[PDB]
């Protein structure tokens, strides 16, 4: 259980409604506690903890530091966003939809997709099943692909068709995989 | 706090243990790249981002600042060491299992603090050094981390797998079993 | 090229 001391610095950018809202929050964290931070909306260093008070007052009295941090929302956030737009934002990975019975349970495996935005529905015949469904959270594989499993409690009978309707930004038309008894 | 997209340009981490450090850029919770501070080179995760160049001198000098900041914060806090958190381990597959075909086994090690972990894979009690890859320490809002290990394999009915995770927040080495069923 | 945010040195 050796001793260990940790220091973290997170230059964080928050974007909303595209390029409309841009906010930079540069956090200076000692162990798991953020001591001091710079927010674009406030325009200066402000201590979260007493441990950040000597850093804030010091850095705020330095004209060269403040200039650099105040222009960082455009130089780092607004700038890097332009590079994301043709790269990360433009990344589209179409999901693979598989239905596996578990039969009283039915699981819709929606795997390997990007971005994280998704909507998946269970249908009995033409009716949409909402009461008997429980969807797992959005699983992050970590290799720029997500996956989700949507389980449905069902009472099967002859002629019944169970449809899994999936909607993703990478698709202009939904993927509807069907399961028959 | 609330935005459409969140990015870290970047995740600067330095701990007294090694002494070790880490530089990464994250976009919407996924690692864009890491800088191998030893090899002095930027290793991009997504093949699209390899059209960009990140100077390793940026990361190297940023880490030289955290080295300074860490020692200063050790003095100010009066050697306030990090408390070892209890990690959360989950083992799942990237896609549904069908034995003949090729799949990837994923080991999520969430709630890591301090970021010192040993993730290893085992097949019927025997260690496997082949086809094992691991992501960098990925940042969390509560200023903790999470790491993901992978094991590329060909599922077999008799072959079972276990994820050997080692962290100071554990009394004994954690082993999460995986049954192909 | 992605632009990085810069941590400043702690006093002193």
């Amino acid at each position, epitope marked *: 259980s050796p001793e260990d001391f940790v220091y973290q610095f997170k230059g964080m950018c928050y974007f909303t409604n595209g390029t409309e809202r841009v906010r930079l929050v540069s956090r200076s964290i000692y162990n798991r506690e953020e001591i001091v931070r710079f927010d674009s909306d406030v325009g200066e260093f402000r201590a979260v903890t007493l441990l950040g008070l000597p850093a804030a007052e010091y850095w705020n009295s330095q004209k060269d*530091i403040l200039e650099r941090k105040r222009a960082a929302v*455009d*130089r780092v956030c607004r*700038h890097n966003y332009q590079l994301e737009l043709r790269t990360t934002l433009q990344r589209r990975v179409e999901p693979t939809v598989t239905i596996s019975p578990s039969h009283n349970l039915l699981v819709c495996s929606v795997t390997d997709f990007y971005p994280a935005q998704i909507k998946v529905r269970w249908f009995r015949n033409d009716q949409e099943e909402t009461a008997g469904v429980v969807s797992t959270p959005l699983i992050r594989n970590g290799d720029w692909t997500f996956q989700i499993l949507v389980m449905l409690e069902m009472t099967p009978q002859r002629g019944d068709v169970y449809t899994c309707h999936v909607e993703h930004p990478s698709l202009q038309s939904p993927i509807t995989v069907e399961w028959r008894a | 706090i609330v935005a459409d997209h969140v990015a870290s340009y970047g995740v600067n981490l330095y701990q007294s243990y090694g002494p070790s450090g880490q530089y990464t850029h994250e976009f919407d919770g996924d690692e864009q790249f890491y800088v191998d501070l030893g090899r002095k080179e930027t290793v991009w995760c997504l093949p699209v981002l390899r059209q960009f160049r990140f100077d390793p*001198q940026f990361a190297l*000098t940023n880490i030289a600042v955290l080295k300074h900041n860490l020692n200063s914060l050790i003095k100010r806090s009066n050697s306030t060491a990090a408390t070892n958190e209890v990690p959360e381990v989950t083992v799942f597959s990237k896609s549904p299992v069908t034995l003949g075909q090729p799949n990837i086994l994923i080991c999520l090690v969430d709630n890591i603090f301090p970021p010192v972990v040993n993730i290893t894979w085992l097949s019927n009690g025997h260690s496997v050094t082949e086809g094992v890859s691991e992501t960098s320490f990925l940042s969390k809002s509560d200023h903790s981390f999470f790491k993901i290990s992978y094991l590329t394999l060909l599922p077999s009915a008799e072959e079972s797998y276990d994820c050997k995770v080692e962290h100071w927040g554990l009394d004994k080495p954690l082993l999460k079993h995986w049954e192909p069923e | 090229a992605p632009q990085p945010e810069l941590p400043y040195p702690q006093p002193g």
Partner: T-cell receptor
Amino acid sequence: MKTTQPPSMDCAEGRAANLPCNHSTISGNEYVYWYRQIHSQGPQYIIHGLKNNETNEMASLIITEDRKSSTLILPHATLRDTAVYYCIVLGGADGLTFGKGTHLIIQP
Amino acid sequence: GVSQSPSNKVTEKGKDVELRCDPISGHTALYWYRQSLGQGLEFLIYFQGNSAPDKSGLPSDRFSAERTGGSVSTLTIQRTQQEDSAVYLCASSFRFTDTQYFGPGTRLTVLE
């Protein structure tokens, strides 16, 4: 991104000296830095800007809307303003580089 | 401002020389430059703290730089050559990549 500027300039004292600089290959995050070296001495920082037309006690800097060209304005040129003026672009980790600059001679 | 010593240095070839640079207080980044009318302003080595990350930019195995304290820096030119004759300039900024402020230089002349 590199800069080009007239090698020599002769201006009358008492009148405002406007020094041009061309930097077409500049990127959004890059700053325009102006240094001067009076002859036998180390360089001296004047001003720097990103987008806005900056002004300080020494001189003023005006960057065009397309950012491809900038100008340094010395409000009332004197014999003390006779030096070589460097226009440089910053920057990432790459580091400072001085060109031939503008050898400005203030005539009385 | 940034201090530099000595102001001038007249030496014979094959001798070793030390160039001191006292930066502005609170500035953790130091830069070393070489200025000759023939060769322009040449970037030699920089420091972020007490360690230099990139040892390139230095002309030969005779050019070394140390900044043990994490403030004042020393540039050492060993077994000097005529080609080394130049005005050695030093700059400092609070942090690496920050605005740089230059010292008065060191005029070095090496003779046969």
